């Protein structure tokens, strides 16, 4: 069951995808609001996948070994330049994480997008499934696709001051490495900003 997504001009097709899961909404809330008085301009040159490497799923890591990436992460792309030059911007997180395994090793990995992420207590990790999430396991799907609408207390919040969504990868089941299976499984994320707006053009150096 292949799924061939697209964002801007880059595409990421996974022939093992199990399904896109929308978080908390399907389409982002209204964009022109009481603030910005209509000074927002939707940028589309920034909807682009940008890879990031994460923790190398290794069997040593036990249940509860959460790996957290804060979005938006440092970006050398057009979006990274846009956040530096624009005081306020809002974009859908659309996180995609793919862990490639031989499928002869059974490991259950839970990838979720949690708003206002906080150090989660060991007991909180058991109840971590409440947030939008998908399970990445070599037995069935090596790729998890999650689309989350941007949600913040303010309509637009400076990304440098605060980041609303942090991708969290948790090893629900320790990878069961086998001779046939891959010794270790890496975890890469194809994150892409979606519905990215900006406001308040900011003076450059």
């Amino acid at each position, epitope marked *: 069951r292949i799924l061939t997504t697209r964002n801007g001009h880059t595409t990421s097709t996974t022939q093992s995808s199990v399904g896109v899961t929308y978080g908390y909404s399907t389409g982002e809330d209204h964009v022109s609001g009481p603030n910005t008085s209509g000074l927002e301009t939707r940028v589309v040159q920034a909807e682009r996948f940008f890879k990031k490497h994460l923790f190398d799923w290794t069997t040593d890591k036990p249940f509860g070994h959460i790996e957290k990436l804060e979005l938006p992460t440092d970006h050398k792309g057009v979006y990274g330049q846009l956040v530096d030059s624009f005081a306020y911007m809002r974009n859908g997180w659309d996180v995609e994480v793919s862990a490639v395994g031989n499928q002869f090793n059974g490991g259950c990995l839970l990838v979720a997008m949690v708003p206002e992420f906080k*150090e989660f207590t060991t007991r909180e990790k058991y109840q971590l499934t409440l947030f939008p999430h998908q399970f990445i396991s070599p037995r069935t799907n090596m790729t998890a696709h999650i689309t989350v609408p941007y949600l913040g207390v303010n309509r637009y919040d400076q990304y440098n001051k605060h980041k609303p969504w942090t991708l969290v990868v948790m090893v629900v089941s320790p990878l069961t490495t086998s001779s046939i299976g891959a010794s270790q499984i890496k975890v890469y994320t194809n994150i892409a900003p979606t519905h990215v707006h900006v406001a308040g053009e900011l003076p450059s150096k």
Partner: antibody
Amino acid sequence: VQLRESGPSLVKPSQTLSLTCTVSGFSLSTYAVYWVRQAPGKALECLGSVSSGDYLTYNPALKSRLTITKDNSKSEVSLSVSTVTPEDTATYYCAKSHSSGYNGWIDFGCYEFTGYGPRYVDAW
Amino acid sequence: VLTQPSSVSGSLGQRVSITCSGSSSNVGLGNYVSWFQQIPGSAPRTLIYGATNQASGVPDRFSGSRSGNTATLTISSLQAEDEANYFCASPDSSQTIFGSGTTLTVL
């Protein structure tokens, strides 16, 4: 880079004890210190680990009988085993990591003692 | 719990191998075994970290390899001065387990 621990004398059964492991030429802000003891005639036993970002992991059995506090500026790690019993007589070691160790509340024994490539162990 | 031979004796100038026996849950789970050599009355030294790489500041004679559920530490041209107790530190499920330890005697 040497580790020095200060331990009390005979502690009466059913009391607590505070051991302080004093690091030297050491970050304690980018490294992690573990607490391992060896009951005589037994194998070593992970007591608990304090990561770089002051996140703690404790031996599941000796958990609730044990606390670990770290102060990076004073550069000393502390261990407080409550409810001491005659079984807890042992020599108590403190170790170094080669990396920060997990900054999570993972709940494992040490969690990093022999993890992966980056973090293994350092001069006790 | 990473059981090891209580006493291992190797003639000086002859390669000696120490075997740490572990279950699938700990030693067998992954190639992440740490070997520590402790001299009596002194803090132990991590001779091998990760079970395939010698730690920095350690002699190259020590060789570390792990096969199946058993991790074996091999010392080549063992010297009387270097003789000390050996511990096969490994990671168990929900805790870290250390080998009982092996006494090394040079004839």
